[PDB]
Structure 1
């Protein structure tokens, strides 16, 4: 099936003629994809020669544990990552239970890519774009059931005082349809962009069933386009949550917000505010702000906060089929479905 519960519709490498491969290291993933570009005669095929389902069984806990003990030594190191460039045959990278990576997955000008069950953390090279996951000019990408983490902290003297660590899931360019679901994102200062600049507007992205904990900002920092955020559990947000900018439209439904500062806002530009349609969240009126520890702050430039907790715009009819559970059920059940080792389980009303 190509159903992701969001805008992206892809089966990834799970199609007719898929070749299954086992990668035991980063370098293996690199060599495997490289071989997947060759035809029966050894000549390269544009977009790839055949579909792939790579099961990553490597484990880099040692690297992860060492970086966690000295987080400020990470930013200056060389970034580590596997690039999936111009591969359109369909590819799925799935981590085996127990696998871990201290390298990122960078998708560029590709399509039909699924990344599942990967535990990625404390990547080196924050000053050199060391993203855990990057989706650039790539439509139909599904980032599901991964655990993306680092430390929600900024060391002194880093370039732009913002490069201790890079992002969890940055999306830019023509990544027209993307679904980011069931991820356990924790300890990340900059979660993810949805547009790299004021000019990089557009895309239809869906963030669902994600569990965010101890994150500073960008859930996402949206620039234009559409964002459908449903059934996410947002806790301990130390900066701001969904920042809807450049006239972007957001549909925020059935999420659970708690201990969050500026959970829904439009700031930093001073103009062209985005809009949001709020519905079914645990917060229903300003009165709930104290109940769930929601705080608001101003910005030096003109801004708009959802402090009245009312819809400020409209949202087109959601194309795909999806069935959200109640915000309370996400608060109760989600932690057990989000992340790695959950066998890619999904939260249904039956389980509520």
Structure 2
């Protein structure tokens, strides 16, 4: 099955001929991927020689706990991450229950990559792109059931006063189809881009069943293309939520917003505002803003907020099958399905 409930359609490494490998450390993952490029005769194969399902059993709680206790010492350290570059055979990196990582996963020019059940937090190297997950020039990637966290805080004197920590799930380039689902993202200042610049526009991304809590912004910072955000729980958003820019289109349906500032907006460019189609959220009209503590702020440059809470454009027919539960159900049940150690459980209307 290649069904991710979103734009990406991939089975990752769970295909025919997949080779199962256990990784006990960051280094093992690197070595395993490196060996997966060799054919029977020891010669390298472009895109990889065989599919892989890597089970990561490592635990780096010590590193995570030390980092949490000294958050401002993280940005200047060397970034730590496993790069999955030009591997198209199909790969799934799934964490064992109880595993943890103080390193990121950087996907570059690959495809059919799935990252599940990984608990990644307080990564070093914010000043040198220490992303928890980065998807660059990579279509058909599925980031599902992970816990990505740090501290929603900015230390004094970091480069650009924005590098205490990098992002949770940055997406850029030709990452044409991506599904980000069932993740528990908390304590993150910059959650994730959708295009690295004003010119890096496009892509079709689906954000569904994610639980955001105490995050500052970029859910995502969208640039062009299509974004389908459904069944997500957005609470304690301290800056802005979905920032639809460079003429992007978004379908925001059956989500639960609460204690959020600028939950849906288009700001920082001063032009080429994106559009949104709102339907089925806990917020149905401006009268609900006070009920759920929705706050709005202006910007120094021309901007568009959804303070009228009305659709400002259209959205193409959703190309895949999905069935959202109600916004009330995500509020009630989502926390028990999102993140790690949930055995990749999915929230169905049956459980509502």
Q: Same fold (TM over 0.5)?
A: yes
Within 1, Cα distance between the matches of 2:169 and 2:312? 27
CA distance in 2, matches of 1:174, 1:222: 14
Alpha-carbon offset, residue 113 of structure 1: 0.1
Gaps in structure 2 of 5+ consecutive residues: none
1:285, 1:331 → 2: CA distance?
Answer: 18
Shift of 1:153: 0.1
Query: C-alpha displacement at 1:23, in angstroms?
Result: 0.1
TM-score between the two structures when normalised by the length of structure 2: 1.00
Q: Secondary structure at the match of 1:258?
A: strand
Q: Determine the structure 1 residue equivalent to 2:203.
A: 203
Structure-1 separation of matches of 2:245 and 2:149: 26
CA distance in structure 1 between the aligned counterparts of 2:214 and 2:170, rounded to whole angstroms: 18
Q: Distance in 2 between matches of 1:19 and 1:260?
A: 44
Runs of 4+ with deviation above 3 angstroms: none
Instruction: Please state how far the C-alpha of 1:201 moved relative to its aligned partner.
Output: 0.1
SS at match of 2:166: coil
Cα offset, 1:205, TM superposition: 0.1
Question: Displacement of 1:135 after TM fit?
Answer: 0.1
- Report the alpha carbon displacement of residue 186 of structure 1 after superposing the two structures with TM: 0.1
Q: Deviations over 1:208-259 (max 9, x none)?
A: 0000000000000000000000000000000000000000000000000000
Whole-angstrom CA distance in 1 between matches of 2:138 and 2:276:
25
- Identify the residue that residue 302 of structure 1 maps to in structure 2: 302
- Name the SS for the 1:142 alignment partner: strand
Say which SS state the counterpart of residue 236 (structure 1) adopts.
strand
TM-score (norm 1): 1.00
In 2, Cα distance between equivalents of 1:333 and 1:137:
34
Q: Distance in 2 between matches of 1:231 and 1:305?
A: 21
Cα distance between partner residues in 1 of 2:249 and 2:196? 17
Distance, in Å, in 2 between the alignment partners of 1:177 and 1:185 is 21
How far 1:314 moved relative to its partner? 0.1
Q: Supply the distance in 1 between the matched residues of 2:328 and 2:249 (Cα, whole angstroms).
A: 25
Per-residue deviation, residues 124-153 of structure 1 (Å, max 9, x unmatched): 000000000000000000000000000000
Query: C-alpha separation between the residues in 1 aligned to 2:299 and 2:351?
Result: 41
Query: How many residues were matched structurally?
Result: 352
Deviations 1:73-117 (A, max 9, x none): 000000000000000000000000000000000000000000000
> Aligned-pair distance for 1:4?
0.1
What CA deviation, in whole Å up to 9, does each residue of 1:275-324 have, x standing for no partner? 00000000000000000000000000000000000000000000000000
Aligned to 2:6: 6
Partner Cα distance (2:99, 2:127) in 1: 26
Secondary structure of the residue that 2:44 maps to in structure 1?
coil
Give distance in 1, aligned partners of 2:305 and 2:341: 37
Cα shift readout 1:305-352 (whole Å, capped 9, x = no counterpart): 000000000000000000000000000000000000000000000000
Query: Take 1:69 and 1:351, find their aligned partners in 2: how far apart are those partners?
Result: 38
Q: Distance in 2 between matches of 1:148 and 1:246?
A: 27
Report the secondary structure of 2:257's partner residue.
strand
Distance in 2 of aligned mates of 1:344 and 1:332: 18
Query: What RMSD in Å do the two structures reach over aligned CA positions?
Result: 0.1
d(CA) in 2 for partners of 1:298, 1:250 = 21
Secondary structure of 1:67 counterpart:
helix
**What SS does the aligned partner of 2:331 have?**
helix
State the alpha-carbon separation in 1 of the partners of residues 24 and 294 from structure 2. Answer: 44
Query: How far apart, in 2, do the equivalents of 1:176 and 1:157 lie?
Result: 36
Aligned mates of 1:156, 1:248 — CA distance in 2: 34
Q: For 1:290, what is the secondary structure of its paired residue?
A: helix
